[PDB]
Design a protein around this ligand. Sequence first.
Ligand SMILES: *[C@@H]1O[C@H](CO)[C@@H](O)[C@H](O)[C@H]1NC(C)=O
Ligand SMILES: *[C@@H]1O[C@H](CO)[C@@H](O)[C@H](O)[C@H]1NC(C)=O
Lengths: 106, 110
Amino acid sequence: QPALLQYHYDCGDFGMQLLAYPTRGRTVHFKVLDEFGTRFEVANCSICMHWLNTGEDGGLIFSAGYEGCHVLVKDGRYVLRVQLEEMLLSGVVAASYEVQMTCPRP
Amino acid sequence: LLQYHYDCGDFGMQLLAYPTRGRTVHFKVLDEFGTRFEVANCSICMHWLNTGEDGGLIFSAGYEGCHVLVKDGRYVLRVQLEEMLLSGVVAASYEVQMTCPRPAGYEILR
Ligand SMILES: *[C@@H]1O[C@H](CO)[C@@H](O)[C@H](O)[C@H]1NC(C)=O
Ligand SMILES: *[C@@H]1O[C@H](CO)[C@@H](O)[C@H](O)[C@H]1NC(C)=O
């Protein structure tokens, strides 16, 4: 059960984007993690500065404004901890990945 | 007889409640005037509601969110828990004052 999902994040001017490229028709659901281990489903919420998009290349994009919900300022940097759930169209999680997005890098 | 407790974290706080068979809990944020504010995830107020893997209910609040007050050098957020039956009736009502430490700036070393 190899966990081979390709993903990365890019730091922008007003927010950051997490891009994942699932294969074989799979999809990816994003969950924000807080300091207590609680998992927050990501849904379009403009006042939170959270948006979900699918790129023209088939990649799935979670965009978060630096001043959006659960983005913290730590050591003069915006930090958001996110769980990526690689999923079959049946809804089962095949693999789960955790990434700490820190912007600006490093 | 509702079991609940809260935790003070570094950036926010969480209130955990464990209602019994078939009951649920509704959360409302209280201000100094007694207004009861419904909690919604999609909100500028930096507060959220989730259901744990054990069926427990979790209220999360950032320290800089709506109606969090500074009192005696500490963050204070008052929340009402309404224990509710499947009929929609309120079985019990509890009020909790979540008090969490706040840092005194460098001025303390005047
Ligand atoms: C908030 O999101 C959680 C999932 O992360 C969901 O279980 C809960 O019902 C939501 N509460 C709302 C929308 O008030
Ligand atoms: C969410 O918002 C984006 C940006 O406006 C939009 O492209 C998308 O269709 C919306 N709905 C989703 C992701 O379900």
